[PDB]
UniProtKB/Swiss-Prot annotation:
Disruption phenotype: A quadruple peptidase disruption (pepA, pepB, pepD and pepN) does not grow in M9 minimal medium, does grow better when supplemented with casamino acids. It comes from Escherichia coli (strain K12). The active site is at residue 293. The gene is pepN. This is Aminopeptidase N. One of its GO terms (biological process) is proteolysis. The keyword Cell membrane applies. One of its GO terms (molecular function) is identical protein binding. PROSITE patterns: ZINC_PROTEASE. Its cofactor is Zn(2+). Pfam families: DUF3458 (PF11940), DUF3458_C (PF17432), Peptidase_M1 (PF01433), Peptidase_M1_N (PF17900). GO terms for cellular component: plasma membrane. Its EC number is 3.4.11.2.
Amino acid sequence: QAKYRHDYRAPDYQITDIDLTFDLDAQKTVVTAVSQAVRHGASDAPLRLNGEDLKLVSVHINDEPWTAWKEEEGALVISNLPERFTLKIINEISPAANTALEGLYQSGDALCTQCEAEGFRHITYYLDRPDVLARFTTKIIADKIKYPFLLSNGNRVAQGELENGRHWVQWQDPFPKPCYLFALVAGDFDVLRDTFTTRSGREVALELYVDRGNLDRAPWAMTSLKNSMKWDEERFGLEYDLDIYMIVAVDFFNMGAMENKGLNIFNSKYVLARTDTATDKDYLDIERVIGHEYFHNWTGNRVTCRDWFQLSLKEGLTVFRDQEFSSDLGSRAVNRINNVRTMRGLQFAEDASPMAHPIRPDMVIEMNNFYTLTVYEKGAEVIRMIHTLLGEENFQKGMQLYFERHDGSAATCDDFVQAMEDASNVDLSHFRRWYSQSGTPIVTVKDDYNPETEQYTLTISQRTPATPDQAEKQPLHIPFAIELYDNEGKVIPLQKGGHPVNSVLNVTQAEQTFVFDNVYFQPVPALLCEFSAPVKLEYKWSDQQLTFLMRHARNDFSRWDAAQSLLATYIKLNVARHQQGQPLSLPVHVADAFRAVLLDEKIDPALAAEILTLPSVNEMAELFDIIDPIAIAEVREALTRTLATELADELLAIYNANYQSEYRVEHEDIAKRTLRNACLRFLAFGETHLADVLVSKQFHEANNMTDALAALSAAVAAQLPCRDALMQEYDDKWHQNGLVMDKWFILQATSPAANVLETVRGLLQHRSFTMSNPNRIRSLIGAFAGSNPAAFHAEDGSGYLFLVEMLTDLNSRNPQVASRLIEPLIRLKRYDAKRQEKMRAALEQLKGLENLSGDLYEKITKALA
Ligand SMILES: [Zn+2]
């Protein structure tokens, strides 16, 4: 049932225009689709239309009832057609019965759609493939009282009233598009309207639709949209191309958001915010996602994907764009740090799992299973490597050539690389292998300083371990950025033979040496600067080299990275000790390094905050071949407690110094607050009474949700006396707000308490929880299985049994959310034999489920192989 990239073949038929009519009703919606088709293939080829769960009413060709057709599994095959003709299909669908949230479905009282990857075929029989671009016109007919707003892509070109309290609106989107970009929304909303005038003077009407009563949480998203539009103009020279830009925030949505042309549909978590309900993180995430979907207007919509194996063509590039947007507007160092934590702690884990795949997949069973950390985040790292090799100027020339050549078409990853190569004259032939090879490369570095010749030599090797999907691995073109520092922290000019050498080394062979002369003093190297390539670095650092970099490295990312390498050594040491029943051991000079960060009056608070944020349990897991989740969790707490004790006075001093009476969603303020709360994490583990008072005080005195949640999280993390009271107070105050309660469910699910599973199971009956909402599911069940590996991997196997129960429900209800939740279970080979046995048993139980979804089937099969 798997489909392969190498089987791509141009369509036998194209549809150039489609006129849709929806007679809307939650129980029974009637769809009438009139398509203008043109044959491109053999004259005897039948037209094969994709369709899922549709009730066919009639088929006409040029108004003639058609008798030469047959329905087969997932398709409508029409034979003996003319070269050009008008196809008319009438079918019925039932939005209310759509619990998978794919196609046209119900979200609360509203009706909305999600068509990517292949959801449009759940609406009508069509050429549901992205290389078929048609001009859409959409007429919507519905009850006026229940659905006063009827929206689709483009501009409103017609509207009217009908008998029996019904009305209609017709939309026209002039830009040809693949059907995955089709969108329809119907319902009653509050609307925030604003305007943005492009650089050339185009006035764009901005409209943000939210559920009634949510207007007080819409301004930030609107502000972010305008910021996104302005930034794309300034940085990429791109302007919006339509007259209106609509965004609809819905409560039931499997994805974070969707870039439907001129009518984006967003999961409300990435839209709604006000100071008492949203944290600094929420604000920055809303900025990131609003920008992301907007950036897709060019990288995804004006230039789309030829086939789904090319998904990264738009996702990797658009993620790169949203990272550059966030970085330009805020702290580049903090953004880079956050994105590298995601790569090392989450994406590396995926590349080391049964689901490993190159950013451009070669084999797919269920395409929705490929909207991954790999396709998105590693995809962006690959785009960033191109940027690193070309430089901003040539990168932009590449973007320009890409649009000149492919604007208005469906392209491939190769087309993009070719545009970059042609515009810059930089050979990316070898570089292309990054698109075809899965797994994380390991770069080993050995060095030598020769005082006799004053030369520094780097011997660099690379290798990518085989993965389940590929037995063959080859060397890649790895941009390896370096910087050399003398004893005083000054940069040593890179040169050889009297000629300067670029700091970005081209590591293209299995092994090679790089010689630098005129190195008058033994240098301390900064390697893989700014995480120049998505690889694991193996270099025999001395603790002093690392603390030296923490104090002298020019780029703040290097300082944080050095601290990570320093901590890695001792996290590994102490996990081994834990398995031997021994307590934490840490050399004095290590605690000294963090004390120095706290007392450094010149360091950016933004950087200090990240250095003082210990790697997560998932980040820590990637430092080990075989994961011991319990040892990792206990060591993380022990490390927190030790630093809390050794730095008690300094932590409190910095906590107080960064107090801010005014709350501002401004980067300098966010940095100080992030630092203050980073200190709070440690202070929560100080003398019980002292910690309990400090934490309870912040929760009650907080004038924003960032500080309130930080305090609540600390109470849970340290199991402080005030915990139960604060948690109940939060529940009583916010139970009616799902997005706010999600933070609470996450805290319950990731609690270090011994009875966490019992609590989580009980919360399935909580008034704020429901299996019908993906956000609730992910915040409670997903957080438990994926963010509390220590509890999920309880030795008795209770965690696996719980997940099996939940997946048994979700497999039938919502396969996509079920597939997101099964990920922790497919990582079984990273655990001990006893755990593997229990996890395999759990997977075998799921494998035998009646009506097993393709989504789960694909992952279960790979995990059990
Ligand atoms: Zn995207």
